Structure formats: structure tokens, C-alpha cells
Amino acid sequence: VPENFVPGLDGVVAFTTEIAEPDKDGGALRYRGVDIEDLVSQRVTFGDVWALLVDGNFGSGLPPAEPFPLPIHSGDVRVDVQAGLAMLAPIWGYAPLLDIDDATARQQLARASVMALSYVAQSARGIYQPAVPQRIIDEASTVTARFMTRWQGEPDPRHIEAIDAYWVSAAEHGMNASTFTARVIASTGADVAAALSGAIGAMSGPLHGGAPARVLPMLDEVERAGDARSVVKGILDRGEKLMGFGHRVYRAEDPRARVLRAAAERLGAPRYEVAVAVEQAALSELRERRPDRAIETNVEFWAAVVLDFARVPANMMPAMFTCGRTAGWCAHILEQKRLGKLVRPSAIYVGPGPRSPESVDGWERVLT
Amino acid sequence: VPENFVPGLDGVVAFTTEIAEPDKDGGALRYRGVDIEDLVSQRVTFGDVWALLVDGNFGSGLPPAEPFPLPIHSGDVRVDVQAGLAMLAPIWGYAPLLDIDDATARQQLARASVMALSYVAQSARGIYQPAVPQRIIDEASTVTARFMTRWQGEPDPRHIEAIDAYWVSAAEHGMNASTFTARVIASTGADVAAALSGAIGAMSGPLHGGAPARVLPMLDEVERAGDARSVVKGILDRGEKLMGFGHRVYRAEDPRARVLRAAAERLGAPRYEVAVAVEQAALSELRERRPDRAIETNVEFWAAVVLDFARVPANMMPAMFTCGRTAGWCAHILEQKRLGKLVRPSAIYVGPGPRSPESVDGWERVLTTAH
């Protein structure tokens, strides 16, 4: 037993990556050395950012999704895509990562990744309404535009811009619980379909983080009252928790939160005026009751505003975060494939010592 | 900014566990301090050993499976159960692990674990054959007996004992890759359905280990030829590698392999004599060619013989190992829930430095909109 053993691999370095660098001490996020704020400002679509993270160079984009309607209908969009991806291996003949070269692995990843987006659009649209015809979908020119058309039918072009802004900013942010899970499964040599399915499972956790905040009810109280300061004061005074704000992640303002806020004003989001007022009031009050800590806006606050601007429901937002994070997942799965090392930590036994089966409680309730 | 880095968390202590002790130096395996070789010797069914690992005591064994026919037919038995388990949460209303007490999580794990057995039995039986009536299944007593009845229709009692031997010996063997995957997903607060589904995905990997070895073609040849030593010699000479024999896992013979060989002989498996003959020939020839290495019989070798004796096909064997490991997964998922600590390591960036998009190879091929 190591003294002062810290569980959870907290701070332990497991991997070395060339994919992306969250420079928290410098307040910037770079994909293969390219700042995400440059990518969004020059309007690089999510399809190409997927290539940059996975391949390392601008080039072979994310292929158009192929006609394959969703076979899973559970009412939970996370469950539908997680179970749907796992079933792609037998039908598409996905060999284990141990038996394929890097070129095949990438194409399998690109095929399954864009198929995951198609599932989420179908699940969001629901089964109580006919699907969008393929001829209509083919009129779209980008992967993000295809997702909006498959889901909404006649999407607003501004909403398509907002989804690209969100998906690029959420594509890859270092070692997560989900990204770690994807690499652990891939380290076992399993096919890419199972690795992506497991990553979605870890993504569904409340403690994983990065999921858009439940701030829409808060943005309605300010809409009714018309005074952001009083609503923020009330929640704190009444003993409730203020949502979308907390301790800083970067050294300062999160770059993703900055670009998402800039995306809201640039696209004329109706909630933008209220959202800024809530943000100013929430920070003035929170920094006043504890002026010694550093308190900055959570990226999840502006993620909720931008997704809501694109008609994304509250129960669909976690799927949207999963859709963008497929870029980081596939890149890390491919990098883990080249590493060729299995992840196998160790545990230290602190349980009971040797004992006969009869000495254990409840032995008389066992037969044979 | 690295050091003499050893990637892969090799030997790094991540958790402390009270569940089971893989005593590799001592050459024994113990569930909650109870030797597996004592559990099998007294014929404790898989349901009670599931209770021992999760609970810590032999009370409140594994409940009977409820009628719920498999909705997933993909052609891969692993895929059917991995996708089927994940679909259980919306219909059964499983809340996330963060929002339930320990008593509920134990019940949800037991309900889903026995359902995973039901899926594997149904998927193995196949869609080209009417399902076994529930009243026929109800005539069984143990959980293992129900699994064989739901699959085979009229199972042989010896085959049922062969599975209780295998499932107990493969229920828990420490912090393997799949158990680690289950604990990581559970630490995020996700519901037990997703944690079990993720564990099966990591199980499917060829490098996870424990998947029963493909020794059946080799055991077929020795039966035809009758010269076990020659067949072993022939396989090595022409560049192939023998199946089920490699580097040692423990200091010496694996007790899991020992009890499986003992079970194969106790139940009169038709392949036992041919398997012992091959094992003796394999060890003799392998240790002569590499005297400086410790070669031991893999547990996968005798696992394949025992599963084959119980009429388990080759492509069903990886699913059978998944069925047994649900005991260890559920115990570790429950232990992780009480720990209440997210698992998140870190990484060191060694990639390219800051650069503009125009300086990236292939920028000329990115189409961008601009109003």
C-alpha cells in the first residue's frame, strides 16, 4: 500500500499525443498547432476539421453519409447511436484493428463517424414523421448541412453556421474520460466500431463534463423579469445553485467560450442580449461573495445558447456534443492503433485474507 | 517535457480493491479470500459466486431472468449482447449511477447481468428455430441450468457442470482491460447499462486475453493421426505457432488452467486424453527449443476443451467468457460507485507548434464560405 495513494490516475501521464494541445496556461486551444479561433474565423467546416485532427493535414474530407436508416428506437438518442454503431461491424465487415493497416482503419473510422451523425439526425427527427427524401438531402454541400437537412428538412443557413461553430470548438480537448475509454478499447485490438460505442457510453456520464448546461430555464426567468441582476441575486440568496459558471479551466476566459459567444452575436441570436446580461450579472455577484477565487464563464453556458439558437432541444444537446467529439475520438483511436501497446494498470488488494467458504456469512443458504 | 516514459500505464496502481486477489507469485486465485479451487470443488453455482464478488457474502444470489426476447440480430453474438444491454436503460428506466443509492445499483446490476446471459443463449440458439418455452426454462433450478435450457433445449447435466466450472474460474481476475473500461465509464456517473456495454466492447479485442484458444483444429489432427508429438513437431517446423501455449501468467501453472483440466477429466470429456497428450508434447518441445524461457499452458487451452465438451461452438466461445466476467464487472462497477472519484489521466503534447491555416499541407483543398 503506497502512502498517500491518490486514486483515479489523477495527474498520471499515460500518453504522448501529437493531435492537439489545450494551452490552459496560455489560454488557447490548437488543433495540430492551428488555433481553433482561426478555424472558426475563416469558416472551416467540421468535415475538414475532422481530417485535420485525424490525418494531421488538410486534405481528404469526411465522406458523405450513405443511405442506412436507423434500426434502434429506444427514445434516448445517446442509446440509439451507441447501440447502432456497435452493430455496424458485422454488416460492414469491420475486422479488428489488429488485422488491418492504418489506411483501412482511417477509412473505417471516417465511414462510421459520418454514419453516427446520420443516426443522430434520424433519432432527433423521430419515428412519428416520415424521413427526409435522399434527393433533398443531396442538395446540401457540407457534412454539417447534410445533418441539418436530414433532421429539420429545410434548415436555416444561420443555424448551420452555428452548428459548425460549436462542432469545431468541441472536436478535441485532450484526454477525457471518453477519449481515454476509446483508446483503452482500441488498445485491446478491437474494431473501431466497438471503440466508438464504448466512448459514447462514457460520454453519457454526468461527471464527464463539457455537456451543454441546463441554463435555458434560467434564461427564461430573466426574459420574464427583464432584470438579470435580480434573478441572479435570487438564485444565490434562496440557497440555489447558479448554473453555467464556476472556477476557471484555462488561466482566464475559455477560448471556446469566447468563440461561441462571438458566434452568437455574429449570427444575431435572439437570446444573445439576455445571455450577455446574465453573464455580466452572474460574474459580478459570484466574484463579490468570494473575491479571492478566479471565476470565469463555463463554456457550457454559451454552448447551450448556440445550440438552442439552432433549434436543438434540451434532451438533444448531449448528442450534439457527442457528434463533434467524434473527431477527437477517431484521431486518438488511430494514434493508439500505431502505438501498439495495451493499457493494463494494476490494483492492490486490501480485502480479507484467505478463508474457507463456510467461514463466509450466508453459507447455510447455498446448496450443493 | 518527457522522461524515460513507459506508455500504457504498465504497472501503475490505479485503484485499491477488496474484491479478489490474483496471487501470481503464490500460484492461486481467491474471490474475497476464498480460493476458486475450493468453490468449484464444492460445486457452487455461478449465481452464488456472483453474489460473493458483488456483495462480499453468499446471500441474495442472482435472480431469475425475466421474459424479454432478444431484439438485436446482427450475426455476431458479442454485438447482439453489447447493443442489447445498452438498450435496457430507456425501457427499464435506469437512472445514472450518480442519482441512485448503493442498494438500487446492486439490484440494477443483478437484473441486467442475468439478462445478458439470456441474450447470449437466445443469440446462440439462432433465429431459424422456435424459442424454448418459458415453462421448460422454469423447470431448471440454477442460473446456469436456465442458460443451457434456454439455448440447447434439453441440455446434458454434465455439460451444465462444465459451464459452472468455467464460469466460476473466469468470473474475476483483477484489473484487466475490460474491467478497467467498466470502472472508467462508471466513474463518469453513467448508468450501469452503459458501463456493462462498454466493457463487452473492450472484451472483444484479441489482445485482451482470455478468449478461448483456437486449438480445435489441432486437436482434430491428433485424433486422426494418433501421434501427438509429431503433430506438435510439424506445426513448429513449418513456421506456425502452437495455440494455447506461451509466456507464463503466474509463477507456475495457472490454477484456472488446473481446475479446467481437472473438470475436463472429472466429467469424462471425449477430448481429455488427446488434450493431455498434446499438452505434454507441447511443453516438452517448446521448452527444448527455448530452455531460457518459462513456458506454461495457457488457461485458454483448457477453456476451449471444456467449452467444446459442453457443445459450445467456436464463434460462441468469446461470448461465454463475457458471460462469466459479468460477475467481476458488476462487483467492480459497484466498488467504483462508492469510491466516487472520476478516472482521468493526463497526456503530454509533443506535436507541432503554432502555425496558420495557410501554412498547413493541403490548405488549397479546403472550400470556405464568405459573405
Side-chain angles (χ1 to χ4, degrees):
Chain A
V1 194
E3 182 65 27
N4 318 309
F5 165 61
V6 182
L9 298 167
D10 203 11
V12 176
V13 179
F15 287 147
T16 61
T17 186
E18 294 176 354
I19 298 179
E21 173 195 10
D23 192 3
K24 295 183 183 180
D25 286 5
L29 178 58
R30 278 178 291 275
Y31 293 159
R32 298 285 187 178
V34 175
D35 197 320
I36 72 174
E37 188 173 2
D38 277 335
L39 293 175
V40 178
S41 294
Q42 306 195 22
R43 313 174 138 176
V44 187
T45 183
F46 176 75
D48 290 322
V49 178
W50 192 100
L52 171 58
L53 283 159
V54 171
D55 279 313
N57 57 6
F58 285 122
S60 297
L62 186 63
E66 66 187 5
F68 177 61
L70 183 56
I72 301 305
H73 312 285
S74 67
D76 195 317
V77 60
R78 185 268 301 172
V79 171
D80 285 5
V81 58
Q82 172 177 355
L85 284 192
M87 303 169 60
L88 290 179
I91 183 170
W92 284 353
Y94 274 9
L97 273 179
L98 195 70
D99 304 337
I100 59 176
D101 51 358
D102 297 12
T104 303
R106 185 207 174 275
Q107 187 264 346
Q108 292 186 359
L109 279 167
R111 188 185 191 183
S113 184
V114 68
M115 177 58 60
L117 305 201
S118 181
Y119 280 176
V120 173
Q122 297 190 70
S123 189
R125 186 178 178 83
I127 65 176
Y128 308 94
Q129 188 191 11
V132 184
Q134 188 74 18
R135 143 221 12 151
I136 284 178
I137 299 181
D138 286 349
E139 294 177 5
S141 61
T142 65
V143 162
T144 312
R146 269 190 276 298
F147 174 90
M148 293 304 265
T149 299
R150 193 183 302 277
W151 167 31
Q152 297 182 350
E154 308 159 348
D156 193 300
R158 302 187 304 167
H159 304 171
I160 311 179
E161 296 205 43
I163 295 301
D164 269 328
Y166 175 68
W167 272 351
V168 171
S169 62
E172 162 56 18
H173 192 252
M175 200 71 38
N176 305 119
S178 58
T179 298
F180 189 46
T181 301
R183 290 182 68 120
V184 168
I185 301 180
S187 70
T188 68
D191 56 356
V192 291
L196 291 177
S197 166
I200 294 179
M203 180 61 79
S204 71
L207 293 189
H208 180 276
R214 316 269 291 272
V215 293
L216 292 181
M218 186 181 290
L219 298 181
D220 284 5
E221 290 195 35
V222 187
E223 183 64 24
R224 295 190 250 105
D227 179 288
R229 205 71 167 92
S230 181
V231 182
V232 176
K233 291 182 182 294
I235 297 169
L236 296 183
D237 293 345
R238 299 196 307 268
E240 324 175 0
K241 185 202 181 293
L242 185 63
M243 292 267 289
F245 302 86
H247 207 252
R248 54 162 173 72
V249 181
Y250 287 71
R251 185 191 49 200
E253 185 181 27
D254 191 308
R256 298 170 298 184
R258 207 170 54 250
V259 300
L260 286 172
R261 175 201 316 158
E265 158 174 296
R266 184 264 299 275
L267 296 173
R271 291 190 172 278
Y272 176 74
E273 295 295 334
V274 179
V276 176
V278 176
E279 183 194 38
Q280 299 182 4
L283 285 176
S284 291
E285 198 74 15
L286 259 176
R287 293 168 167 162
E288 208 172 54
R289 325 210 174 194
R290 215 170 58 173
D292 51 324
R293 292 290 186 184
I295 295 173
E296 290 282 352
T297 305
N298 284 20
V299 64
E300 296 75 5
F301 178 87
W302 288 108
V305 177
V306 171
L307 291 175
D308 182 70
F309 169 64
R311 305 225 178 284
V312 175
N315 62 0
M316 187 189 166
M317 287 183 174
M320 297 299 293
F321 184 61
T322 296
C323 282
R325 194 46 68 83
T326 60
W329 285 346
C330 291
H332 275 267
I333 291 173
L334 188 55
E335 201 183 38
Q336 179 66 36
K337 181 197 187 309
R338 302 193 181 106
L339 183 56
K341 189 70 176 66
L342 182 66
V343 182
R344 172 66 158 88
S346 296
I348 293 177
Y349 179 75
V350 296
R355 46 170 176 166
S356 61
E358 304 83 10
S359 62
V360 181
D361 301 332
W363 175 250
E364 76 284 353
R365 303 173 61 180
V366 183
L367 303 184
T368 312
Chain B
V1 65
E3 176 60 28
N4 289 19
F5 190 45
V6 185
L9 302 176
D10 215 9
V12 174
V13 179
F15 314 97
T16 53
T17 185
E18 310 171 341
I19 299 177
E21 181 182 7
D23 188 4
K24 300 203 174 67
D25 284 319
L29 181 67
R30 286 181 292 270
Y31 298 167
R32 299 282 189 172
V34 194
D35 199 313
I36 65 167
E37 191 169 3
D38 287 332
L39 293 183
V40 182
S41 305
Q42 316 215 18
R43 312 197 164 182
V44 179
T45 184
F46 177 72
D48 292 326
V49 186
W50 194 102
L52 172 67
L53 288 149
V54 180
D55 284 340
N57 45 285
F58 285 102
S60 324
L62 186 63
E66 66 183 2
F68 180 61
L70 176 70
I72 299 316
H73 309 285
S74 69
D76 194 342
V77 54
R78 183 267 301 173
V79 169
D80 286 3
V81 62
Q82 179 178 353
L85 283 195
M87 295 165 53
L88 294 181
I91 175 178
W92 290 354
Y94 281 171
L97 263 181
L98 200 62
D99 307 330
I100 60 174
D101 50 336
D102 296 354
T104 302
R106 151 72 156 82
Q107 196 275 336
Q108 296 185 354
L109 288 167
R111 182 186 183 190
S113 185
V114 67
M115 177 60 56
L117 302 192
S118 179
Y119 282 171
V120 169
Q122 296 184 61
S123 186
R125 183 178 180 82
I127 56 179
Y128 302 90
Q129 191 175 9
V132 184
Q134 182 75 38
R135 60 188 197 90
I136 294 296
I137 309 177
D138 292 335
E139 289 186 334
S141 62
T142 72
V143 169
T144 310
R146 295 169 190 277
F147 173 85
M148 300 291 286
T149 302
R150 190 190 300 273
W151 166 36
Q152 297 189 352
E154 283 200 8
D156 196 308
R158 296 191 302 166
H159 298 166
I160 293 185
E161 286 183 349
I163 296 303
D164 270 330
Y166 174 69
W167 270 354
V168 167
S169 69
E172 177 64 26
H173 193 260
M175 194 62 51
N176 57 53
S178 62
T179 298
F180 190 49
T181 305
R183 288 187 67 111
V184 167
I185 298 183
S187 76
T188 73
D191 59 2
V192 300
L196 287 177
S197 166
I200 302 175
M203 182 67 98
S204 77
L207 274 179
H208 180 272
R214 180 65 67 88
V215 308
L216 265 182
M218 171 182 60
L219 299 176
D220 275 335
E221 174 71 9
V222 180
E223 176 62 36
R224 193 200 71 172
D227 199 312
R229 198 61 146 85
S230 172
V231 179
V232 170
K233 271 186 177 297
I235 295 176
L236 280 180
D237 283 339
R238 65 170 172 263
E240 307 181 23
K241 183 180 180 181
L242 272 64
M243 303 295 302
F245 301 92
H247 201 259
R248 62 175 175 86
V249 178
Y250 295 0
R251 175 205 302 273
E253 183 186 49
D254 192 321
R256 297 177 303 175
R258 175 169 63 253
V259 305
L260 288 184
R261 181 200 300 104
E265 175 268 354
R266 175 169 75 259
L267 302 176
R271 297 183 169 275
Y272 169 75
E273 188 156 341
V274 194
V276 167
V278 170
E279 182 185 8
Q280 182 273 342
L283 295 183
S284 300
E285 192 77 358
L286 281 183
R287 301 200 176 110
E288 289 184 355
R289 304 197 175 190
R290 293 166 97 239
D292 290 0
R293 293 316 324 188
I295 298 98
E296 300 285 352
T297 305
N298 296 344
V299 66
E300 293 86 342
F301 180 84
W302 283 107
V305 178
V306 173
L307 292 181
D308 175 73
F309 167 58
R311 275 153 43 84
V312 171
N315 45 18
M316 189 187 166
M317 290 184 174
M320 290 297 294
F321 181 48
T322 294
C323 286
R325 194 43 53 80
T326 60
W329 287 343
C330 288
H332 274 271
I333 289 177
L334 185 57
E335 194 183 42
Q336 180 66 40
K337 177 191 183 302
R338 300 194 181 102
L339 185 60
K341 172 103 200 74
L342 185 64
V343 174
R344 187 199 173 276
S346 302
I348 299 182
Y349 180 76
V350 294
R355 47 167 173 167
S356 61
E358 301 88 8
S359 66
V360 192
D361 194 76
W363 174 248
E364 75 275 3
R365 298 180 68 86
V366 177
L367 282 72
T368 58
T369 62
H371 68 279

